[PDB]
Amino acid sequence: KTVFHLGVTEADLNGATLAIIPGDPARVQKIAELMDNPVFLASHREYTVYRAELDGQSVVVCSTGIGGPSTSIAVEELAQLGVRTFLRVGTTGAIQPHVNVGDMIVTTGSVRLDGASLHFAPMEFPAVPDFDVATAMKAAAQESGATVHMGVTASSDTFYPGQERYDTFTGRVVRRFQGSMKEWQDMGVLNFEMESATLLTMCASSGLKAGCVAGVIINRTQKEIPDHATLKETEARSIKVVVEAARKMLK
Amino acid sequence: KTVFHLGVTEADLNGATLAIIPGDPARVQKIAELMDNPVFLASHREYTVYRAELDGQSVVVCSTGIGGPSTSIAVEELAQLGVRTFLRVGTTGAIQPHVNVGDMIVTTGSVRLDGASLHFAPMEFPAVPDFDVATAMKAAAQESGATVHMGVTASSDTFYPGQERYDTFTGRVVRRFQGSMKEWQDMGVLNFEMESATLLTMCASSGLKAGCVAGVIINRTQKEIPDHATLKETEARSIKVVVEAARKML
Amino acid sequence: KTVFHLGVTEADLNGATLAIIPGDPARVQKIAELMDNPVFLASHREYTVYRAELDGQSVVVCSTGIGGPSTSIAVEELAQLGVRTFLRVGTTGAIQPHVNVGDMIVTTGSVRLDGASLHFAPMEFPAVPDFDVATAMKAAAQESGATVHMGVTASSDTFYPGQERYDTFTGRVVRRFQGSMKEWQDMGVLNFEMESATLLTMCASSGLKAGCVAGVIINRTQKEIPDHATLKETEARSIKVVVEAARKMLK
Amino acid sequence: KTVFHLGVTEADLNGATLAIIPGDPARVQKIAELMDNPVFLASHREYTVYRAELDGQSVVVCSTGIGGPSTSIAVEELAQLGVRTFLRVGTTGAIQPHVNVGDMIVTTGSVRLDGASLHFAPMEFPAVPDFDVATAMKAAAQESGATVHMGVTASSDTFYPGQERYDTFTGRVVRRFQGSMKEWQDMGVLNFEMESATLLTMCASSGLKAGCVAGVIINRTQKEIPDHATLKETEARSIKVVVEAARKMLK
Amino acid sequence: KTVFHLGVTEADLNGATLAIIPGDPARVQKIAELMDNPVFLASHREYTVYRAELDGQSVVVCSTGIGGPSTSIAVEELAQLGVRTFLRVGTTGAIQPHVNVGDMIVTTGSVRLDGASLHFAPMEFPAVPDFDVATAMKAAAQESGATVHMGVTASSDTFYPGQERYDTFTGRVVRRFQGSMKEWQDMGVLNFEMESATLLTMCASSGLKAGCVAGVIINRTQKEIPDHATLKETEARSIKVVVEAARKMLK
Amino acid sequence: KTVFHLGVTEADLNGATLAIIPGDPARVQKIAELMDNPVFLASHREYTVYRAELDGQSVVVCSTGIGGPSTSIAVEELAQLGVRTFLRVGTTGAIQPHVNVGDMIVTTGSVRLDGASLHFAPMEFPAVPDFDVATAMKAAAQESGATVHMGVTASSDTFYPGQERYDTFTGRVVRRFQGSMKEWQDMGVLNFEMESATLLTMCASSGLKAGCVAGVIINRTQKEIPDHATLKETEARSIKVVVEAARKML
Ligand SMILES: [Cl-]
Ligand SMILES: [Cl-]
Ligand SMILES: [K+]
Ligand code: NA
Ligand code: NA
């Protein structure tokens, strides 16, 4: 009746079969307010849950927290309450020099540098979005006017060594990830993030539709720092895009 | 420069940056003749190479043979000669009951039950098609009147135990693949095929655009050996689709 | 010099070298409250940070959120700011019949059913706590009058399939985890939780001291979803213990 | 009655229990014509099937195409039709400086750098030839007057990165295969090819007798290009040897 | 009624529930004679078995030989005869620069660079000692006045390449172990040894209590082969420690 | 210059380039006495080392103890002292019905269910004996009059769960090895053993010549208990065979 982590019932969802899932709980209300009659449902741990209405249809907005584990919980419990489509939205740092701040990335596949994806399908299984969702996301992102990159995302269970960051406490990176960023860059990988492999694998192997869209707020190959105005616009466009993607997904 | 296996030069390709790559060498000419001015280029081993023209643009048709290994050779050598986009048109076995023989399946991602993909990217890397290619294949399949399915393909380095076929000489399936078909089926995997994992991983990790459309010649809900009656019709439909998909990519 | 996620500085920590790291942001204040001069530092995402004083020494309390990924971020950024010792206090599902709800388990080693641990050390590396911390946790737990169990914890990147829960949306569990709970039970594994493998492996391979003590909120031999009853009193004991464990580490 | 890929029946084989299996379909007739009454059976895909008679006994010659996958099909379908002994013949590129063009390599074991072998046996299983076959091949090869090398062959699922070739489109080789040729060389590996691991593992784990014999036509460590006559002699010798090996295998 | 390899009966053990298990057969008599009424039981292969009495309780001393395999046999067959606690006392090579010859190392966890541990638990399982044993070992070692180190031990199935020794016949080390010693050192791993991974994993997963204490006979930051001069003295201190650790475990 | 574990020098071996390596130290003298001028060199741990003479050539006999780890030490340290050929001899339990007690098994390849082999070569590398050694062993075994089996051996790091034994303290076998004996049986594996994967992988990847021969003294699939006479005859034949195998190698 009431799922263990989200603290929400099916009734609270008002027939919603689609959820927009940001990572940050503070972003949930912002996304919900883009739609009609946003309603606060619950807030427990990293899970802030809102409901809103899009073209007369109920839409859930639920934060996942950082990482596949907390994400897998949110998706599972929402799925128990009837949610079938999951739209990942956020902002990300690109690792390709041709990708600029303000561009949109729609994940076509994820490098599974996570662990939670393995709890739903063996490693050989592709962390791939639902085609309709990826299509809707591409459409919404392009209609926003932004430059849109359809490509592979490296999905890491860590923010630091898994994204080959050396500016750390130990300043070192395990053997597996040494020189990994260059390897991903050469393989055409667009960006790092921390939830897509879990989300895509879990859903693609569980009869759920999922996809990931993100605004690029920084480029690790570029030394130039984006201004607050461009960052604000990119954040806003990212959530505008995901809501329009939701609109395209609704029937 | 003449590539080792394909036996063709970049000049032979006449500026072609797109290749249609069937597995069956006999399908190459059949695909090429759906296009303009088809010309036989070379035939060596499982590699039959034709060149043709589609809306004024050169297109290569080149068989890959069966399997990731022979496929990886074909793509690499075509890539050396300037080909950047690869459209696999193949035959496949459906593992979902609702899929019918004669249907088309466009791979959105491949289960990597192959070995060759590992020679281009670690297993964590997704065997995913280029989005434009997958989109073009879906559109082409629909516009050709075909019934098309978008979804995950289990891409196996074997035809028999890796696709959990039991009607074999030993009748055994190695532990790893025991119950695998139902596991894939439960996970929503649409079909079995042998080249998509290699092709998709190799291309997605090498700056090449790839995709796989395949005609369903069998449903594993019924049997293990594809009926010989529907093969040619299904193939004919698939090549119509892949050529139209190529047209959309150009 | 503020860390990326936690939003705190080294100055904010007032020389703290020890951190208590609950998973639940709500539990942070509750822990800091048991110490002297608790002060809210920051709250961003699943990271709520308080500072407090224990026997005249500054102690950080910082939520990790659910899962290895968000935990690894908290630990790394706290480490950048001078923290060297991390005490996880959390909730857990015991899988041994002789362990009761309300009991406490000090992890002596974690089964690495996560992904983040691999970003710090290969799978062969033991997810083992610092010996001094485990010692301090055992003594603190005993001195609190509660029944304590020393032993191995299965640390999963998921709450559902990785802990072999079948009462789910798909009702399926991937081949890897089919029959896994019985396997762990037969191997003497005490409980399931979601952060210890990451925490212990990361710290044991990074020159950081870590340990995990957890209150049993459910016995998996009985059911899959923990009773909401006694969730509070179990939580109350665990944080009492972890503070005393911290006191022993600072002595 | 008719096998799906090869397009032949048991009757077409005329009681043959031994098959010579070259990679190249264009080579099948050549091998068959070394024996008595060569008869074209079928040609489909990379599979050209001939029948011939050796000392009054029927022998099948069937191409496999390049790679374990296409090979596994031919072996399986031939096995269904009664073939129990499989003699791989072809030419190869050595990686040892002491192995010269014109020499014969008889595989005593294969490094499993393929995928198909795993579909018959886990990686721990040795890709080993049947001892009688290896013995017969060594005998035939030595009786040919050529210098014969008995040793380990590296069996790669690719021609390019798996054999650490950098003269490619991307010019890159995955981490796994970087420095791999030198590793194999130092381990005494004689040559690269692309079928033996699959063939040998499949047969050894399925009650089939298999072995691989190859003429050396190029050496990765040598810069000299062998002349046309030498290449022709080596090709001719290789198929003469495999037929003589078949003769020794026939009972 | 005699166990397969050890050649002893339960009656021979005289009610012993605790075993001291050195690797060296010659060390068995030395250990036994530190206690009361030492008696030779049997010697077959690498298994020399003695019995003695410590505070009126029977203690069995049994060599394991070198390696997880022979160790697993000894542990199993002793467990068949009622032994529940296993104290490994061994020799070890220091990985850290300031762990000196003659120091004692108590293993808090083992890097599983072995194969035998996998025969009892998958790699995710922690090679961790029983807490009481590790506690008793630390106490005994510290009370003895020895210089004691608590920490992670790299436990290898080989003495040479698995402990990155280069002064060997080939002078080669497989890719996996190239640079591994520095990796372990940077991760804070204290020492190399060959039995702890198997012993600890086996026991922790089989309801047996185990621990490993080892005398440092070489510092690997200096050389590869232990000097003979300090062997006897280091061994003498280590066995004094393990006997006292046995005393602490008995009750 | 004495090697650390074996406690012998190169001079001690008197130019020996071949070693016979039984697992049991007690069997070293029994092997050495089949040859000329046997001499005790050293005994430390599980390593009893003898030197002997076979047709005028020095041959070392050295025990390895049970398991790959201790075996790898002996092989390495002997190799440092000039030994290049290693003949493992022992007795084993067969898992195939057609393999009777008294028969001889010459390993053609080993299932690497060990850990030490990985310290010399990745798992993909075949645990294969030197062909001359295997050939010499087959010949020597045949000349003794015993039925000889050439085939794959499952080489386990444990005696109990790795050989799927349930008559143990816990009675438990880890998931990996559950049903494993039947798997190997179906794959035609002849026997279980505990040293060959390490020995063969180490030597085949290090320019050393190795092989394994073993008399069968028990069959997992047979109820019948072998009598003392046949057992005694089998262990005696095994060492006779390995000495003759050594003779053929020299
Ligand atoms: Cl099919
Ligand atoms: Cl050492
Ligand atoms: K041993
Ligand atoms: Na989280
Ligand atoms: Na092929």
UniProtKB/TrEMBL annotation, chains A, C, D, E:
Cytosine binds at residues 124, 175-176. It is found in: Cytoplasm. It holds the Pfam family PNP_UDP_1. Residues 17-245 form the Nucleoside phosphorylase domain. It comes from the Bacteria. PROSITE patterns: PNP_UDP_1 (PS01232). CDD domains: UP_EcUdp-like (cd17767). Homohexamer. This is Uridine phosphorylase. It comes from Vibrio cholerae. The gene is udp.
